[PDB]
Structure 1
């Protein structure tokens, strides 16, 4: 939930609300502010020259955002961050945050812990993209999804609400191809798809 250290930090921040689908951070912007999700979830994405989008990660309540430019001035935001649901996010200037670190470094410890987890997760993603064919990547994804907090249940494993587009942004493939692969998987008796709902055996 929360504690006095986190609340001490938050009392130094201004809270802003972001409707679902609104962009909090744009790639290329000058990085001078740190964010903290008090409520809601977001998606972190990068793009290709022709507009193809790839989702690097989903982040939720309790997660810091916009932290990558904190340790060196003059850096640009490394990706776009968009609200997945309605969000309430705390924000504070890098300058003010660095001053807080000196008062109580524990706040930096908490931020660093999340960066470490993100590097582990992103590195696993590199491996999947390099060693698994699109079919195996989709297979693996239909699992990592049952890990998210928004994940639900079902007698035969668990149910999730994911679209072809969302899957494609995660594995690096068109909606069309994702559709063909999903059909093969349920043909291989691995899953059961019903609209935007899927059953993971």
Structure 2
């Protein structure tokens, strides 16, 4: 076990969220912090007309809703949706702050995650500003081929994801994804036989 994590979790109250549930609504009052004990979620934002973009995938071990923690009166900056059934620990910002004074390590862990997320979203700004849709898709296929849920393949790496998701990640239609995925197969960069894609 991890003494610090277990120490922290003992000050939290756990709850469950079924797949497709919305844990955090954008615009909502930020006053609580979350910690994914089990499961995975998606962090989403939207344009004026319902188009959704996935900012990130968070998983077991990741903190959520930390952005309103250092300043009161702030609202949630995005929507968080359960991809799979989730077990989440929740604690008020007030209590977490008291825990910080007790052992700063817990904030160091939270901050490390914030730093990673900043690095990743910054690279996201890069892809959106410098690459055409073909480049973003190809870059996203390579990215996923490194994540944990990524498997090993005799011809490379295998991943499980739908065209809709790819679209929400790179900012394009599922049909555009479908067409681009095929063109990348003709370029012998990947192999698409189902929602499973083999990347070389």
TM range (shorter): over 0.9
5 Å-filtered alignment, 1:141-156, equals 141-156=140-155
May I ask how many residue pairs the two structures share in their alignment? 200
Deviations 1:114-155 (A, max 9, x none): 101110111001001111110010001001112222111210
- TM-score with structure 2 length normalisation? 0.98
CA drift at 1:179:
1.0
CA drift at 1:180:
1.1
Matches of 1:89 and 1:151 in 2, distance apart? 24
Matches of 1:10 and 1:177 in 2, distance apart? 44
Q: Which runs of 5+ in 1 are unaligned?
A: none
Matches of 1:199 and 1:105 in 2, distance apart? 43
CA drift at 1:197:
1.1
Deviations 1:13-49 (A, max 9, x none): 0001111111110101100000001111111010001
Q: Which runs of 5+ in 2 are unaligned?
A: none
Matches of 2:198 and 2:51 in 1, distance apart? 28
Matches of 2:107 and 2:177 in 1, distance apart? 40
2:166 maps to which residue? Answer: 167
RMSD over aligned CA atoms reads: 0.8
1:114 maps to which residue? Answer: 113
1:86 maps to which residue? Answer: 85
Matches of 2:109 and 2:187 in 1, distance apart? 44
- TM-score with structure 1 length normalisation? 0.97
